[PDB]
Design a protein around this ligand. Structure first.
Ligand SMILES: O=P(O)(OC[C@@H](O)[C@@H](O)[C@@H](O)CO[C@@H]1O[C@H](CO)[C@@H](OP(=O)(O)OC[C@@H](O)[C@@H](O)[C@@H](O)CO[C@@H]2O[C@H](CO)[C@@H](OP(=O)(O)OC[C@@H](O)[C@@H](O)[C@@H](O)CO)[C@H]2O)[C@H]1O)O[C@H]1[C@@H](O)[C@H](O)O[C@@H]1CO
Ligand SMILES: [Zn+2]
Lengths: 222, 213
């Protein structure tokens, strides 16, 4: 199991600094160039920095030169990224990546990726969400709808689930939307047969780790 | 720096048809150091091809890469519905650069949405804001027209839409549209309607409620 795991993301004010970590397993780490690649929300991919197996050759994109510093520790199977003087353009999901093996130079292509960690550059304050229920009506083809409205939160992300993972079918959870507030909002809905409104309870579990928010709203007919 | 232009921007194809994606570099790519990634929403990129044509380990045979110098191609001979994704090309011969990608929709038969409308909660009217939500569940194609009418007056500027990715099972979309109002303008009106017009609809569908129900 080749694994890369990033850590250290979060919300940081413009001009601030943040240190990213990526631990790696499942391969001879000290024979590999380790690489950082980022993806701003909605946009494509942009290579940030790379480092050879013994830190002899260090490479940065011009967008981050002088501001970001990369380093590794072959005794901990870990690569690091000291970010300083952070701009709005640096708001991205930061990936730690490894080349497919036997590559001719330090910067190439990347077969293995981490899950990515999200770095929000903004002076807005972390704000937990407000979870309001979307009460089921009373029917198209015998189908009813219901959900939870997750309103006004910052920064990304929030996860939503139903009956803590048990309900999966019919759920349609939507991408967050940026209000003119500057805060995010989303809905998560479920389609059900109308009759099962009496034979099951529907509890939406909303999670906002950026503020340690955990909300369990029960949705009933109004 | 080298610029990678991918064409087309979007590609909508039925299952079984063959997809042909293109990547053109502003210069020549040394030793044909060109890769193709597949990225599905919320996931990390999955390397498909590199060195123009070498398949990565574990990638199906339908994914083949061609090209040389400034013109590279990615072919997807058979298409399963699990190929709804964005496909990026990337050079590493020069700084390394990515294309902006080619979206690949999976085509299917026309499906009309079932429409639902949600009045604001009363927890939320205490808050001072009214959110009216309109749901369009599992339809195809993605093209659909949702409009809000408050006391039969068409609204403008106070709506935001949100769309799911293509379902893996039936390859449909589902759409959210949230109409945001004040507690004041919300209670100075009565009839709130959501009007949906879609290809698989003989004529627009309207779901509505009166503030007393
Ligand atoms: O320890 P070695 O054997 O080598 C030391 C290196 O400094 C050497 O390679 C150097 O000369 C050239 O590097 C090149 O030039 C830069 C000098 O610093 C390097 O840049 P970088 O430092 O940034 O390296 C970039 C890239 O080459 C690596 O990331 C990696 O992909 C290679 O594959 C790895 O190395 C094996 C040999 O090529 C491969 O074996 P391979 O079986 O092909 O791996 C397949 C892979 O699936 C599995 O290995 C993996 O899942 C589990 O491990 C891979 O393990 C290289 O590009 O020491 C050697 C070497 O110095 C010389 O042969 O004599 C020494 C005798 O011990
Ligand atoms: Zn670009």
């Amino acid at each position: 199991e080749v694994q890369l795991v990033e850590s250290g993301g979060g919300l940081v004010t413009p001009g601030g600094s943040l240190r990213l970590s990526c631990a790696a397993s499942g391969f001879t780490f000290n024979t590999y160039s380790m690489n950082w690649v980022r993806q701003a929300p909605g946009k494509g991919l942009e290579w940030v920095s790379s480092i050879s197996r013994s830190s002899d050759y260090i490479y940065y994109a011009d967008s981050v030169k002088g501001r970001f510093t990369i380093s590794r520790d072959n005794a901990k199977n870990s690569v690091y990224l000291q970010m300083t003087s952070l701009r709005d353009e640096d708001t991205a999901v930061y990936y730690c990546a490894r080349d497919p093996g036997g590559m001719p130079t330090t910067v190439t292509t990347w077969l293995y990726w981490g899950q990515g960690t999200l770095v929000t550059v903004s002076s807005a304050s972390t704000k937990g969400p407000s979870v309001f229920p979307l009460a089921p009506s009373s029917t198209s083809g015998g189908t009813a709808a219901l959900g939870c409205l997750v309103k006004d939160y910052f920064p990304e992300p929030v996860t939503v689930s139903w009956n803590s993972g048990a309900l999966t079918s019919g759920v349609h959870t939507f991408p967050a939307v940026l209000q003119s507030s500057g805060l995010y909002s989303l809905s998560s809905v479920v389609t059900v047969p109308s009759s099962s409104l009496g034979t099951q309870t529907y509890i939406c579990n909303v999670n906002h780790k950026p503020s340690n928010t955990k909300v369990d709203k029960r949705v009933e007919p109004k | 720096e080298i610029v990678l232009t991918q064409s087309p921007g979007t590609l909508s194809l039925s299952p079984g048809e063959r997809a042909t994606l293109s990547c053109r570099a502003s210069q020549s790519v040394t030793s044909n150091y060109l890769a193709w990634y597949q990225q599905k929403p919320g996931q990390a990129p999955r390397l498909l091809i590199y060195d123009t044509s070498r398949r990565a380990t574990g990638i199906p045979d339908r994914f083949s890469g061609s090209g040389s110098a400034t013109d590279f191609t990615l072919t997807i001979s058979r298409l399963e519905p699990d190929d709804f994704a964005i496909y990026y090309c990337q050079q590493y011969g020069s700084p390394v650069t990515f294309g902006h990608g080619t979206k690949v929709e999976i085509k299917r038969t026309v499906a009309a949405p079932s429409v639902f409308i949600f009045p604001p909660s009363d927890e939320q009217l205490k808050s001072g804001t009214a959110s009216v939500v309109c749901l369009l569940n599992n339809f195809y194609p993605r093209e659909a027209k949702v409009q809000w009418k408050v006391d039969n007056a068409l609204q403008s500027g106070n709506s935001q839409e949100s769309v799911t990715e293509q379902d893996s099972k039936d390859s449909t979309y589902s759409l959210s549209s949230t109409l945001t109002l004040s507690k004041a303008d919300y209670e100075k009106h009565k009839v709130y309607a959501c009007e949906v017009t879609h290809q698989g609809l003989s004529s627009p569908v309207t779901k509505s409620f009166n503030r007393g129900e």
